[PDB]
């Protein structure tokens, strides 16, 4: 179920949180271009997490009903990161 879902404003502000510098190569990984990732670190000047946020915004509303956990989980995969952050978070 949840796994389906797709993360809210206030989870995809936890995932940037909990987040380090991976969160480029897993958006990347997800879908979005370098671009996206130059956009959001541009429209974020002197906030990181604000750009991590709005990277992961992007891909929601890009992918939609395919932007889930499931997604999420993978990606983290992808850049060799602990997906367990995933299950903390969730609990």
Known sequence: H???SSPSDRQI???AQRLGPEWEPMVLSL????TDIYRCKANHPHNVQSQV???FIRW????GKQATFQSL????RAV????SL????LE
């Open 80 to 83: 060799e990161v602990d997906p």
């Open 13 to 15: 502000n936890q995932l």
């Open 31 to 34: 879908g979005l271009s370098q």
């Open 2 to 4: 949840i796994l389906n």
């Open 53 to 55: 946020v709005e990277a």
């Open 73 to 76: 989980h993978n990606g983290l």
């Open 60 to 63: 929601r509303q890009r992918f």
């Open 86 to 89: 995933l299950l903390h978070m």
